[PDB]
């Protein structure tokens, strides 16, 4: 009934009253120190669904990743607006990025072993331990590493560098470590005698990165 009695008492236009009563907009009874767009929320303020949702439940967004394409950022890492989350994805907001349904789980298994190697004394550089990439030794001339045991060969190749395990029967009788710059002359399942060269060391030889 125009002008509205409810609208006149509460100082609300027909539009605003309509929007509130018909659930098109929220209206603020207790601001509870809310802040929207830099201005603190006043009592009796009219909020849209997006504003009220942003205020009450927070802000966030999910970005789809194309198949077979890995993410650029890390799980749990803070993000800045404009920062690329992936080659095809740019984040619109700032905050914590979370992984949604990782399709591939890569498990790095820890292995602690013990392996022998033989080198010319002049080539070796004495150290109590070796960091990955650190120089193990330097050969003035090509050198041949010779098998000190007899048996069948198990050749286990890492990203770079290799492990070579000699075994008679079931039990491994020897374990050798071939660093980078050392080319194995044997294949898997090959039979070797003592003195028969396993690998060739040519020039500088260093520890693998892994």
């Amino acid at each position: 009934d125009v002008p509205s009695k409810i609208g006149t008492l509460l100082d609300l236009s027909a539009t605003e009253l309509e929007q509130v009563l018909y659930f098109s907009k929220y209206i603020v009874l207790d601001p509870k120190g809310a802040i929207l767009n830099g201005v603190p929320v006043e009592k009796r303020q009219l909020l849209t669904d997006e504003e009220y949702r942003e205020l009450r439940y927070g802000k966030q967004e999910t970005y789809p990743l194309p198949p077979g394409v890995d993410a650029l950022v890390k799980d749990g890492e803070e993000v800045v607006k404009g920062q690329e989350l992936a080659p095809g994805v740019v984040s619109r907001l700032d905050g914590v990025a979370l992984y949604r349904f990782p399709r591939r789980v890569r498990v790095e298994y820890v292995k602690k072993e013990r392996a022998g190697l033989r080198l010319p004394l002049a080539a070796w550089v004495e150290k109590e331990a070796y960091k990955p990439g650190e120089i193990l030794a330097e050969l003035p001339e090509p050198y041949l590493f010779r098998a000190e045991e007899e048996g069948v060969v198990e050749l286990k190749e890492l990203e770079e560098g290799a492990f070579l395990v000699l075994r008679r029967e079931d039990e491994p009788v020897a374990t050798y470590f071939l660093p980078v710059g050392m080319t194995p002359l044997v294949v898997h399942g090959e039979i070797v005698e003592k003195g028969q060269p396993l690998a060739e060391a040519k020039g500088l030889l260093r520890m693998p990165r892994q």
Binding site: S24, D49, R100, F101
Partner: protein, 346 residues
């Protein structure tokens, strides 16, 4: 302005679930229910009460109300005490509380996401006596039942299982709420079968069937009388405001007499009847007239037995029955003489 559009838009704000997301939410829901069961085991509390408390905390203080199944009224005090009795558990026990919370949240999101399916199903049920939005809400109830009953272990898509409960809810709704005079769902189904039967017969015969033909086509146990009575019982009422004459002037209800309230002629008739009966009972002695009045109930409104009137006047039942007889006899004589009370006999 247009509620349908506004609700479609509100529905559109929730994004659809990827298979992974759907499976996740369903999983969280199932594990959640299991966690509520576990909390019921540990706490020795009611699964319902715990569920309502967890739900109350997830939804917030905005919605707090007494639940029909709960033996205890649910108020912020009670949910606070129960929340504290839950948080007072050891770590491994307190785990299930978190599982339950996230379970309820997942339930909420699952429903909110599958809200569109309800629309797409309900749009086909229009014109059945229920409004579009009504069908949507009932379909929503179906959707909720589905979310609660779903098992992700079967590898099926949620839409498949939910569709059944949505259709079921909508059909239940229509069968229940469509008619002004409520017809039990089974009877409704019967009436509808009768409809489709008669329609098949009219489509084959090239004319409307008789009661007998429908009775035949309905199988054993159906005769013409039964079909006729079933059609009679399926009749919907008509509006008193249906306009008669083509104009804004007249209403059907204006032509319908009132058979309940007594006409002035009726009131006059009964009044004259009581007055004439009193005129006739005054020609007797007060005792026999009182006996007749107590025996026919003119006094207190009810008819006394011979033993009660005999005990009221302090005489044998035989005596009071004899007094009743002589009174009736004197009245019959007075009536034969004056012919006054004849006209009231109709």
């Amino acid at each position: 302005s247009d509620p349908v559009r506004q609700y479609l838009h509100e529905i559109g704000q929730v994004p659809l679930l990827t298979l992974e997301e759907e499976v996740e939410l369903a999983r969280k829901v199932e594990e959640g229910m299991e966690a509520i069961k576990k909390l019921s085991e540990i706490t020795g509390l009611d699964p319902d009460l715990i569920r309502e408390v967890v739900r109350a905390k997830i939804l917030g203080s905005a919605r707090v109300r007494h639940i029909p199944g709960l033996k205890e009224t649910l108020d912020p005090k009670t949910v606070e005490e129960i929340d504290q009795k839950l948080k007072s558990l050891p770590k491994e026990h307190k785990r299930y509380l978190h599982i339950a919370r996230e379970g309820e949240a997942a339930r909420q999101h699952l429903i909110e996401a599958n809200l569109r399916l309800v629309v797409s199903i309900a749009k086909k049920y229009t014109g059945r006596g229920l409004s579009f939005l009504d069908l949507i809400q009932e379909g929503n109830q179906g959707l909720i039942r589905a979310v609660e009953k779903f098992e992700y272990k079967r590898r099926f898509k949620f839409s498949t299982y939910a569709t059944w409960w949505i259709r079921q809810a909508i059909n239940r709704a229509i069968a229940d709420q469509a008619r002004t005079i409520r017809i039990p769902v089974h009877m409704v189904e019967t009436i509808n079968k009768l409809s489709r039967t008669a329609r098949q017969l009219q489509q084959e015969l090239g004319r409307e069937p008789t009661y007998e033909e429908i009775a035949e086509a309905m199988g054993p146990g159906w005769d013409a009388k039964r079909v006729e009575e079933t059609l009679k019982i399926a009749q919907e009422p008509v509006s008193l405001e249906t306009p008669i004459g083509d104009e804004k002037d007249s209403f059907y209800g204006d032509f319908i007499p009132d058979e309940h309230l007594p006409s002035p002629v009726d009131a006059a008739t009964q009044s004259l009847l009581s007055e004439e009966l009193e005129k006739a009972l005054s020609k007797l002695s007060e005792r026999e007239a009182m006996v007749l009045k107590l025996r026919k109930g003119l006094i207190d409104g009810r008819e006394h037995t011979l033993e009660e009137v005999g005990a009221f006047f302090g005489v044998t039942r035989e005596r009071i029955r004899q007094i009743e007889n002589k009174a009736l006899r004197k009245l019959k004589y007075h009536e034969s003489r004056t012919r006054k009370l004849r006209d009231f006999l109709d």
